[PDB]
Every structure is written in C-alpha cells, then in structure tokens.
Design a protein around this nucleic acid. Sequence first.
DNA 1: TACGCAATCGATTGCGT
DNA 2: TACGCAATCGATTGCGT
Lengths: 338, 338
Amino acid sequence: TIKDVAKRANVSTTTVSHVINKTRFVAEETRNAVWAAIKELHYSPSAVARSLAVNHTKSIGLLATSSEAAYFAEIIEAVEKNCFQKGYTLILGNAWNNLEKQRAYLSMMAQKRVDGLLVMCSEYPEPLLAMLEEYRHIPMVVMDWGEAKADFTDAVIDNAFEGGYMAGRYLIERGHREIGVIPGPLERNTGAGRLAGFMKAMEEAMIKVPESWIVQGDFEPESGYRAMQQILSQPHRPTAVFCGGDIMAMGALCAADEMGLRVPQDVSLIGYDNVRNARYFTPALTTIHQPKDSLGETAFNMLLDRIVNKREEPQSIEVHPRLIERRSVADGPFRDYR
Amino acid sequence: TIKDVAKRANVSTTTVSHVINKTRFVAEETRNAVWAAIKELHYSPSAVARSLAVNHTKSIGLLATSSEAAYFAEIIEAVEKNCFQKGYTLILGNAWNNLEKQRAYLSMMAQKRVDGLLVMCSEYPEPLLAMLEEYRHIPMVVMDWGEAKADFTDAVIDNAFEGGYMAGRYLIERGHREIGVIPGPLERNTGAGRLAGFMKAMEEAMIKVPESWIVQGDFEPESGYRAMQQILSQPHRPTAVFCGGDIMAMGALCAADEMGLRVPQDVSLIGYDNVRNARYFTPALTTIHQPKDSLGETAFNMLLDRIVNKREEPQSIEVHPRLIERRSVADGPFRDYR
DNA sequence: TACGCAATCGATTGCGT
DNA sequence: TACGCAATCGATTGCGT
Ligand code: HPA
Ligand code: HPA
C-alpha cells in the first residue's frame, strides 16, 4: 500500500516514507501531493512492516497475575497511562500463578518481540526464576519483590516490611495489646513481608501473638470473611486486628457485622493497600497506603531507560508506604497507661 | 535468524519452517536436526516477520474506557481469558471517554493491524460513531449498547431496561412506594436504560418519583455518597433506594451509615451489577446481576466468527440480567396490603 | 519421496546524482 | 537542491525435481 501511495503522488516510496516520518526535507508541493494521495487512498502504514524494518515494536508486555483485584487493577491502569503517554502499546497477560500459563505467555511475548517486559507474578518459585532468566535478553522489570532476587532484572521495591511495622505500631500506640492478624500468602512479598514487619513491632513490644490469632488469607474477600469469623469465633478474642489487604479486610468487616460485632467498638481493624474505595468501606477503613501509581510509573520508567539508554546494569528503586487514618480503629485498654 | 537455523541443520529454511509449523511432511532425522539447531541457537521465530507474511497478527484490541472500575475490570479479565484460550494476544486501551485519546488509540490499533476490535466506550456521540465507521474494515464488536446503533458492527445487548424494571418491581412487591433513585450517566446504556426500565415499573404502579429523589451518579463511590446524602438529607425521605451500580451503592451505604441511618432498617437499597464483591458489602448487597463473563465471551465469540468465518453481516446477541436477593432490602409499609 | 528456489508481505535507509 | 535505487528486516508458500 505504501507503493500505491507513491504512485498516486508520482514520487518514490522513499519519498512517501520521509514525508510520513519527517525524516528528511521535502518540497512543499511534494509533501502536499503525498498527503493528498494518503488521504484518498485512506492509508494507514503497517506498524508491522515498519517494526520488521526498524527492529522494535513500540509495545510493552505486562506479565501479570490477575487483573480484576482492586490492587492489581489499580496498578495496571497506572501502567497503561504511561504507555499511552509515551506511545507504547500494552499487552496484558494474566498467568494466574500458573507455570504453564506463564511459560506460554512468556513465549508469545518474545515472539511478538515486545520492547520490554513488566513482571507481576506474585509468587516466584525457582522454575519461574529459571524461565525469566531464559529471557534476560528482553529487558524487564519485576514489580513485586521485596528485594532483588536476580541480577538480570530491574526491581521496584515497596518496603512492605516497614509498612507492616507501621501497622503494628499504630495499634500499640492506640492502646492495644491483644491482636490478631490475617496475612496474605506467605509465598508473596505483600504476604510474608507485611507480616514480619508487623511481627517485629510486636516482639519489640513484648506482645505475643497466639497462633489461634493468626489466620491466612489469600487476599480475597471470602478469605477475610472466614478468618475474621474464625478469630472472633473464639472464647478469647483480640481487641484489634491487622488485616493484610483492604479487600480481605472488607470481608472481615462483613463477618463482624454478621456476628453482630461492632467496628470498631467491639473490634478495631486496620488494613493494607489503601485501595481506591477503602474510604467507602463501612466504616471508612484505616489502612496502610501503597503508592500504586508511582509504583507503576516508576517501573515503566526504569524499563524505558533500559530500553532507550540501553542500560545493562540491573537497578532497583524503593517506594514507601504510609499510614492513612480513617475510622476502623479505636483506642485500646492500654492507651491511658503509656 | 531462521537462516541461522537452517544452516546449522543444513537444510533450507523452507524446511525449518514446515517443521516448525508441521505444515508438510518431514523426515524424522531432518525434523530432529532442525529441532536441535533450534535449541542451541535458542531460536524464537519472529511473529512480526510471520505476521507480515501471513496477513494477520493473532492479536485483538480492546478499546475500553477505564479498567480499574470493578465492573469493567471484571469484563476485561473475562475477555483476556478467551483470548489466551484461543491464542490471541490482548491490547488494552483506555480512551477515558476522550475523543482525542480515542482517535489516537484507534489509529495505533489499525497500524498495529489487530485482527479485530472490542469496543467499550461507554458514551457514543456522533463524532465517535463517525470514527468507528472509518474503520469498519477492521472487524469489530461493541459491547455496551442497549440496541444496535450501526450496521457496521456486531453488538452484544444487555437488556438493561428489563433489569431496571426488575429492580423497581422488587421494591414494589416488598411493600415500598416511596423510592428514590441514583442513576448513572444518562449518556450511557447502563445509565439511561436502567433508569427507564425502572421508571416504567413505577408508572405501572402509579408511583411518582419526586425529582428531589432522583440524583445523578457517575458510577463512582463518591457520587453514590453525595447522592444518598442529598436524598436522606431531606425533610421527606423515601423508604427505599434504587442505586444504578454496586460501586456507587457501596458509597450510598457509607453515607447512610455516616448519618447514623440503618440499612436496611431505616432505608432499603438495591444495586445493579452484582460485582464480585457485593456480597461482602455491609450489609450484603441485594442487586441485579449482569452476566459480565458471558458478556465477554460472547463478544469475543462474535469477533472470532467475523474474523474466521469472514462473516460480513452485522449481528447482535442479547444477554440477560437477573435478581440476586441479599440483605439490603426490607419489607415496606405496604407489604401486607397486596 | 522428501525437500529446495525465489518471490512476497510493507515498510526503511545508505549511497548517489 | 531535492529526491530515488536497491537491499534489508524474517519469516511463507507455490512450483518444481
Ligand atoms: O497479591 C495480591 N493480591 C491482591 N491484592 C494484593 N494486595 C497486595 N498484594 C496483593
Ligand atoms: O459505565 C459504567 N462504569 C462503571 N460501572 C458500571 N456499571 C455499569 N455501567 C458502568
């Protein structure tokens, strides 16, 4: 079709090309003619033809986990914004924590020759670590590790441990000493890391968390429901709960309310994520906020760099959580005594 | 690189190719050699090279609106599943209801030569209608109209009017006659359509909805908050509210609770969407369920058809809403009198 | 029998004149 | 000065032998 254009305008295609990309000077009339031909023919240059010739697709691949979950969804949207903004195209892939799915998506990606790769796989067993190295040639940034687990990628780190600690401290500072916790999968950063930060704050305070008070969630509302229920279902119950993710938390409120428990009058609850609509939870959720957007932009930024400035050295940038006081926490029995 | 392979295996590339695609018979040894070469060289065939030669990219484009919103997010995830499943690649684009953004994304899409297009633009002013026609050559399905607004696309229709009516009736059947409503943007199907279905049920019942009882939302939690508040902020208030979308609804619960209003003891509320976590709203939300997944799969299916079976005629399939009884509705003053 | 030649798909870009 | 020739980017596939 570029031939079709040239001919209509009676110039070579080389010409058509340069005018299309302003890649060299072209006489007005000439330009005009080309433009005209372009219009009638209703021409749209193939980006594939071009990608073949130039050696880059101007498209980036997001190897995600799931995309419905608030947390993820929020990140992804951030990511797309940046792509769009710098003319990149986004290929979204959810491997659902499945190796096969993940091997598959990784292959299509390389095949489709994506300029770079955004990685959000949640859990990283060796085998996954392995595959990724196998593709170290395509530039990539992992967005969900707590620390850099490989020299062949860039990493954006969230300080989930310091976020967990922040959560514990708050409770402690508000008068609590009988706390429970519902963490996310230990196989994840946002899971293991948040817990531990939180646990350090407890040891520091000589607070012991009875194992019947720790219940594993999977970041899903239903998981928060079951755990909360199991915690309050007990003879002896905490006066406060630390829930590893806002969504699971929303599930914890439900249950409490279903047991006719008052939040935060009968139980205080603090989340983690500060998902877009946590403020509208009932009650407005107190939580630790994760800078999801900066988390996306920053990742996209390292990618571009590696891409354009052709950096070779793995890099890593940290981002920081922060506390958001809303209304699910109330003073505890020991407030007055500090 | 395909040359590199051939040579290592001392066969032509034609050979390499057929073995790679099992496109014709190849001697065992031969196959073997090729496979071997493929391995050492660590070969990944360019899908772009191939797309150029075959004339299809095996990738589909989703021209969305936003992707964080529960409703959307849920659809998109459905969509990706199907792509993956039939080997398609997904390009996600959010035009945020912006013509320019939308013209831009549409262009990149054509340029990237996507096999088909999935359309979710929410609002369709003429100008948008115009652009789309300009690309009628690339196959496409609109997923959010209430009726077919063009002969050049396939359409999947949701019966949002019958869903709205379902909502009104429920209330009526539960004893209510003083109702308010918070609809989504009238410029959208899910907005205008739901309202009207709902309004028909009212006229049928000789119920009049005082304009101070209808407050426009934008499907966002904050919008539900403000509206609910404005409704209950009044001297005279309804005993029941019909909220146009679960998320805005979640915002309505918040407000009520903030005004110390009881749900559904002081006010009954019914949503629309049956978003993944409406069951965990506090209280568990009664709502109209939209078959989001079938909505995605069905769309993807029409697309494939047009694509493969090269259909030319616009088609349109309807999907159906249904009621989900949870706990935000309570009997009304007139229950006993029917 | 089993495989290879050469032209094609739509663009870019270094030499030239 | 302002533009064009021809080779290249990585694959497919119809004829042949
Ligand atoms: O893995 C996760 N899933 C869902 N929400 C989350 N918030 C933090 N981590 C996660
Ligand atoms: O346009 C919409 N936006 C968000 N949620 C929705 N649910 C129905 N329609 C919509």
